[PDB]
Design an enzyme around this catalytic site. Structure first.
Site, PDB file in Angstrom:
ATOM      1  CG  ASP A  57     -25.682 -12.506 -36.682  1.00  0.00           C
ATOM      2  OD1 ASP A  57     -26.262 -12.404 -37.780  1.00  0.00           O
ATOM      3  OD2 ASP A  57     -25.098 -13.547 -36.318  1.00  0.00           O
ATOM      4  CB  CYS A 111     -14.803 -15.965 -32.140  1.00  0.00           C
ATOM      5  SG  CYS A 111     -13.408 -15.020 -31.465  1.00  0.00           S
ATOM      6  CB  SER A 112     -14.657 -14.143 -36.780  1.00  0.00           C
ATOM      7  OG  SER A 112     -14.414 -14.052 -38.171  1.00  0.00           O
ATOM      8  CB  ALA A 113     -10.721 -11.676 -34.907  1.00  0.00           C
ATOM      9  N   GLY A 114     -10.654 -14.507 -33.093  1.00  0.00           N
ATOM     10  CA  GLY A 114     -10.024 -15.181 -31.973  1.00  0.00           C
ATOM     11  C   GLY A 114      -9.480 -14.247 -30.910  1.00  0.00           C
ATOM     12  CB  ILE A 115      -8.995 -11.016 -30.222  1.00  0.00           C
ATOM     13  CG1 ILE A 115      -9.917 -10.210 -31.143  1.00  0.00           C
ATOM     14  CG2 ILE A 115      -7.755 -11.516 -30.981  1.00  0.00           C
ATOM     15  CD1 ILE A 115      -9.213  -9.100 -31.892  1.00  0.00           C
ATOM     16  N   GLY A 116     -12.114 -11.562 -29.381  1.00  0.00           N
ATOM     17  CA  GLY A 116     -13.270 -11.021 -28.683  1.00  0.00           C
ATOM     18  C   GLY A 116     -14.025 -12.044 -27.860  1.00  0.00           C
ATOM     19  NE  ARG A 117     -18.910 -13.644 -31.566  1.00  0.00           N
ATOM     20  CZ  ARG A 117     -19.619 -14.060 -32.612  1.00  0.00           C
ATOM     21  NH1 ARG A 117     -19.879 -15.356 -32.784  1.00  0.00           N
ATOM     22  NH2 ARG A 117     -20.055 -13.172 -33.493  1.00  0.00           N
ATOM     23  CB  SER A 118     -11.511 -16.495 -28.440  1.00  0.00           C
ATOM     24  OG  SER A 118     -12.033 -17.116 -29.608  1.00  0.00           O
ATOM     25  CD  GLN A 125     -11.510  -6.744 -31.036  1.00  0.00           C
ATOM     26  OE1 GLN A 125     -11.842  -6.060 -32.004  1.00  0.00           O
ATOM     27  NE2 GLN A 125     -10.278  -6.724 -30.531  1.00  0.00           N
TER      28      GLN A 125
HETATM   29  C1  LIG Z   1     -11.046  -2.690 -30.051  1.00  0.00           C
HETATM   30  O1  LIG Z   1      -9.642  -2.947 -30.358  1.00  0.00           O
HETATM   31  C2  LIG Z   1      -8.852  -3.657 -29.519  1.00  0.00           C
HETATM   32  O2  LIG Z   1      -9.242  -4.128 -28.467  1.00  0.00           O
HETATM   33  C3  LIG Z   1      -7.435  -3.834 -29.954  1.00  0.00           C
HETATM   34  C4  LIG Z   1      -6.379  -3.281 -29.128  1.00  0.00           C
HETATM   35  O3  LIG Z   1      -6.628  -2.601 -27.961  1.00  0.00           O
HETATM   36  C5  LIG Z   1      -5.005  -3.426 -29.499  1.00  0.00           C
HETATM   37  C6  LIG Z   1      -4.641  -4.120 -30.697  1.00  0.00           C
HETATM   38  C7  LIG Z   1      -5.660  -4.675 -31.534  1.00  0.00           C
HETATM   39  C8  LIG Z   1      -7.084  -4.544 -31.179  1.00  0.00           C
HETATM   40  O4  LIG Z   1      -8.139  -5.084 -31.978  1.00  0.00           O
HETATM   41  C9  LIG Z   1      -7.962  -5.250 -33.390  1.00  0.00           C
HETATM   42  C10 LIG Z   1      -9.316  -5.217 -34.060  1.00  0.00           C
HETATM   43  C11 LIG Z   1     -10.000  -3.822 -34.012  1.00  0.00           C
HETATM   44  C12 LIG Z   1     -11.385  -3.824 -34.718  1.00  0.00           C
HETATM   45  N1  LIG Z   1     -11.267  -4.675 -35.926  1.00  0.00           N
HETATM   46  C13 LIG Z   1     -12.275  -5.373 -36.467  1.00  0.00           C
HETATM   47  O5  LIG Z   1     -13.444  -5.404 -36.030  1.00  0.00           O
HETATM   48  C14 LIG Z   1     -11.885  -6.224 -37.719  1.00  0.00           C
HETATM   49  C15 LIG Z   1     -11.279  -7.613 -37.283  1.00  0.00           C
HETATM   50  C16 LIG Z   1     -12.158  -8.331 -36.261  1.00  0.00           C
HETATM   51  C17 LIG Z   1     -13.369  -9.010 -36.663  1.00  0.00           C
HETATM   52  C18 LIG Z   1     -14.194  -9.654 -35.700  1.00  0.00           C
HETATM   53  C19 LIG Z   1     -13.816  -9.630 -34.275  1.00  0.00           C
HETATM   54  O6  LIG Z   1     -14.474 -10.184 -33.174  1.00  0.00           O
HETATM   55  C20 LIG Z   1     -15.713 -10.916 -33.256  1.00  0.00           C
HETATM   56  C21 LIG Z   1     -15.548 -12.305 -33.929  1.00  0.00           C
HETATM   57  O7  LIG Z   1     -14.523 -12.892 -34.036  1.00  0.00           O
HETATM   58  O8  LIG Z   1     -16.721 -12.790 -34.407  1.00  0.00           O
HETATM   59  C22 LIG Z   1     -16.221 -11.031 -31.803  1.00  0.00           C
HETATM   60  O9  LIG Z   1     -15.536 -11.075 -30.836  1.00  0.00           O
HETATM   61  O10 LIG Z   1     -17.578 -11.084 -31.717  1.00  0.00           O
HETATM   62  C23 LIG Z   1     -12.620  -8.959 -33.904  1.00  0.00           C
HETATM   63  C24 LIG Z   1     -11.796  -8.315 -34.877  1.00  0.00           C
HETATM   64  N2  LIG Z   1     -10.962  -5.620 -38.671  1.00  0.00           N
HETATM   65  C25 LIG Z   1     -11.235  -4.889 -39.757  1.00  0.00           C
HETATM   66  O11 LIG Z   1     -12.378  -4.662 -40.059  1.00  0.00           O
HETATM   67  O12 LIG Z   1     -10.180  -4.431 -40.456  1.00  0.00           O
HETATM   68  C26 LIG Z   1      -9.789  -2.985 -40.640  1.00  0.00           C
HETATM   69  C27 LIG Z   1     -10.093  -2.149 -39.348  1.00  0.00           C
HETATM   70  C28 LIG Z   1      -8.260  -2.848 -40.915  1.00  0.00           C
HETATM   71  C29 LIG Z   1     -10.575  -2.382 -41.825  1.00  0.00           C
END
Ligand SMILES: COC(=O)c1c(O)cccc1OCCCCNC(=O)[C@H](Cc1ccc(OC(C(=O)O)C(=O)O)cc1)NC(=O)OC(C)(C)C
Length: 282
Positions: free
Chosen positions: A180, A214-221, A261
């Site tokens: 988690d 995954c959830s957002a499709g950018i971290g784990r994926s 992420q």
């Molecule tokens: C760190 O940022 C970046 O790398 C980044 C960048 O460089 C350039 C552009 C965008 C970027 O990244 C964009 C996201 C930055 C951080 N945002 C968040 O955590 C969340 C959405 C999110 C949820 C789970 C996840 O991942 C999990 C999963 O899916 O379970 C996993 O992988 O385990 C990844 C993203 N948004 C949110 O709370 O809304 C707000 C913030 C609006 C309140």
């Protein structure tokens, strides 16, 4: 030697710094379609959108939008569609994509519920006798068989295009043990999972690109595709030590924002590539 680089970053504990440089140099492109008011409900997260240039378009004159991106790795000879976990209202769109893109496999790296909330909709049937039908996109999905293992479950699903009555077998690879919080202790099980996906043929060119989420499709994926491509490159190149994970990651970010992420995920990716290289190699 990235294992040598790995130990340096660790020694001087500078993962945050390196991860941050990658973020700074990462590409940035328009996401106009994703932000159109009419597509508000097709996005799980406001800050996670597909670039217009690499978004997957649904084949329908109505609304062709879905939060998914085609990551095309030219040299590696591999492609992946990274997408968010579907929403209550985008499951029909999700399977439409899988059908139109001619995907053989769907890779899931999360659980429907995590940290006490929904991270993804139950988009596949859990019982053979309870098939699912997506009226909006006219698709029928049936659980054919399921194989539950310790760290993952592989499901066989039959996807039918009710319009043409055509059918296809889809393999659902579900990694079920991702924590988690943070990343896996050892890339061991994550790697075996990847290899199982490779073995199914779902990543091979005779099929459409595998769908990953995954959830957002950018971290784990992100971790999944980055590790797979890097391994594949070390396998192709005359000098496997020339594969720079940081550069591969940046090439991928040209197709979808925020891949990887956290600095933890970055270190984990190194860890998986290094370990997977030791096994795959000798
Ligand atoms: C760190 O940022 C970046 O790398 C980044 C960048 O460089 C350039 C552009 C965008 C970027 O990244 C964009 C996201 C930055 C951080 N945002 C968040 O955590 C969340 C959405 C999110 C949820 C789970 C996840 O991942 C999990 C999963 O899916 O379970 C996993 O992988 O385990 C990844 C993203 N948004 C949110 O709370 O809304 C707000 C913030 C609006 C309140």
């Amino acid at each position: 030697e990235m294992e040598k680089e790995f130990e340096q970053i660790d020694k001087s504990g500078s993962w945050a710094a390196i991860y941050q440089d990658i973020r700074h140099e990462a590409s940035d492109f328009p996401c106009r379609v994703a932000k159109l008011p009419k597509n508000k409900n097709r996005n799980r997260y406001r800050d996670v959108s597909p670039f217009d240039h690499s978004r997957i378009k649904l084949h329908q004159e109505d609304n062709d939008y879905i939060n998914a991106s085609l990551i095309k790795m030219e040299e590696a000879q591999r492609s992946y569609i990274l997408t968010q976990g579907p929403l209550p209202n985008t499951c029909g769109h999700f399977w439409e994509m899988v059908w139109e893109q001619k995907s053989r496999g769907v890779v899931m790296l999360n659980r429907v519920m995590e940290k006490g909330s929904l991270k993804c909709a139950q988009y596949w049937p859990q019982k053979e006798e309870k098939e699912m039908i997506f009226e909006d996109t006219n698709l029928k999905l049936t659980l054919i068989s399921e194989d539950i293992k310790s760290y993952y479950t592989v499901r066989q699903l039959e996807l039918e295009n009710l319009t043409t009555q055509e059918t296809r077998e889809i393999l659902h690879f579900h990694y079920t043990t991702w924590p988690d919080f943070g990343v896996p202790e050892s890339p061991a099980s994550f790697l075996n999972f990847l290899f199982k996906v490779r073995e199914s043929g779902s990543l091979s060119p005779e099929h459409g690109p595998v769908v990953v989420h995954c959830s957002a499709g950018i971290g784990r994926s992100g971790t999944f595709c980055l590790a797979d491509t890097c391994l594949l490159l070390m396998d192709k190149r005359k000098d496997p030590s020339s594969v720079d994970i940081k550069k591969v990651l940046l090439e991928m970010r040209k197709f979808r924002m925020g891949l990887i992420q956290t600095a933890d995920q970055l270190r984990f990716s190194y860890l998986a590539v290094i370990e997977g290289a030791k096994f795959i190699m000798g």
